[PDB]
């Protein structure tokens, strides 16, 4: 089954653009005349549960593999069973010596590495 994402653009907090003190992270408004809370025309859209994506295609990359974070080679040995549905992702702090050990091991085990470079 392919992937369809019900929405691509992120959710940005209201007036996040206007102010640097207002973060770019979603907080639900609480004013009783807030046009954003009252969902007027041309206002920003509030996150709802209706936007949730398909269960069979959730936490899936556009190549249909769920990203499993890998710290050492003994974690890649765990993806032995699930090479057809999980993609091994190298942790960002694994040193250069271990990183090549994981990539070579994953190549031998037939486990795709998201950030092999």
């Amino acid at each position: 089954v392919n992937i369809i994402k019900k929405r691509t653009k992120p959710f940005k907090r209201h007036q996040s653009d206007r102010f640097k003190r207002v973060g770019e992270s979603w907080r639900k408004p609480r004013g009783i005349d807030s046009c954003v809370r009252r969902r007027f025309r041309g206002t920003i859209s509030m996150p709802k549960i209706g936007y949730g994506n398909n269960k069979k295609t959730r936490y899936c990359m556009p190549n249909g593999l769920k990203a499993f974070l890998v710290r050492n080679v003994s974690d890649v040995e765990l993806l032995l069973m699930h090479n057809k549905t999980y993609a091994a992702e190298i942790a960002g702090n694994v040193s250069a010596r271990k990183r090549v050990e994981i990539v070579e091991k994953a190549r031998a085990l037939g486990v795709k590495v998201t950030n092999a470079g």
Binding site: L78, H82, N83, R107, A108
Partner: protein, 120 residues
């Protein structure tokens, strides 16, 4: 006491073999057959099982029984396979015919990817 009370201790949440991820969990134990925290897989949880692993271009199968399940030194019985891939598939499944055969698929699957690893 028995397999289900042990299950609700070692299996359900806390083990030394569990890996909980973004939405699910794995099972690191070497003697597993799926890699998942499932009853039909977890030996700490369940009685006699069978699963295979890889050593230096060679395969080995481990088996256990119930009378011996209290003596951990010789609890697992190992058999070494160093002949061929298709032979290994037949050497494994033949020894598990008297055994429930629901997990023969998982066992046979494991040998294939272990063999594929040896080739690659």
């Amino acid at each position: 006491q028995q397999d289900e009370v042990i299950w609700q201790v070692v299996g359900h949440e806390f083990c030394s073999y569990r890996i909980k991820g973004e939405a699910q969990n794995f099972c690191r134990n070497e003697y597993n057959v799926t890699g998942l925290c499932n009853r039909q897989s977890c030996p700490l949880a369940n009685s006699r099982y069978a699963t295979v692993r890889e050593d230096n271009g060679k395969l080995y199968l481990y088996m256990k029984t119930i009378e011996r399940a209290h003596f951990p030194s010789k609890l697992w019985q190992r058999i070494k396979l160093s002949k061929n891939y298709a032979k290994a598939l037949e050497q494994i499944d033949q020894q598990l015919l008297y055994w429930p055969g629901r997990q023969i698929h998982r066992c046979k699957q494991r040998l294939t990817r272990l063999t594929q690893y040896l080739l690659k």
